[PDB]
Amino acid sequence: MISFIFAMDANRLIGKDNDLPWHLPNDLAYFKKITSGHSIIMGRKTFESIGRPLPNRKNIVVTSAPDSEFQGCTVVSSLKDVLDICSGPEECFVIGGAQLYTDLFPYADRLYMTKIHHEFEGDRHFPEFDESNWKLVSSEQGTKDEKNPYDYEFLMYEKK
């Protein structure tokens, strides 16, 4: 099973200069809660943006690099390998970046979208998709506080 998790702004922005466009600590805490217990699948630039493997998850990096360059991870060279690893009932989380979200979109079963109601500047976007193909299963407004000073919400869609 393939689930996506991502945070995007009102213009579908996810990144700028190989980095996040904002700081939203409660959303990162949510990401940790959701992805705990699961293999996480990421592109090489997303791994480097994170900087070190995330704890308590199998970190799978899609890259042409040798395995030796990402020893704290499991390297695969093709998304075919991702589908083989992820086939069946056990849930993989695809954690970006734009290239994986776009190319793996037809194979996603679930979308865990943090929607930030703001427009930032940047250079990487989540792919357009027709929301009419999806059911909104859950929605929760994110805490707006001093550390998390946006209007944001945690949405989960499941494919029809």
Residue from 3, 35, 46, 59 binding ligand NAP (CB under 6 A): 46
Instruction: Indicate whether 2 belongs to the interface with ligand NAP (CB under 6 A).
Output: no
Q: Which residues contact 62 (CB under 8 A, 6 or more apart)?
A: 41, 42, 43, 44, 76, 77, 78, 79, 81, 82, 100
- Rounded Cα–Cα distance for residues 106 and 102 (Å): 8
Instruction: Indicate whether 26 belongs to the interface with ligand NAP (CB under 6 A).
Output: no
Q: Find the part of the chain contacting ligand NAP (CB under 6 A) among 33-41, 60-68, 135-143, 147-155.
A: 60-68
Quick one: CA dihedral 43, 45, 50, 53, positive or negative? positive
Residue from 24, 92, 98, 156 binding ligand NAP (CB under 6 A): 98
- Residues near ligand FOL (CB under 6 A) are 5-7, 20, 25, 27-29, 31-32, 46, 49-50, 54, 95-96, 114
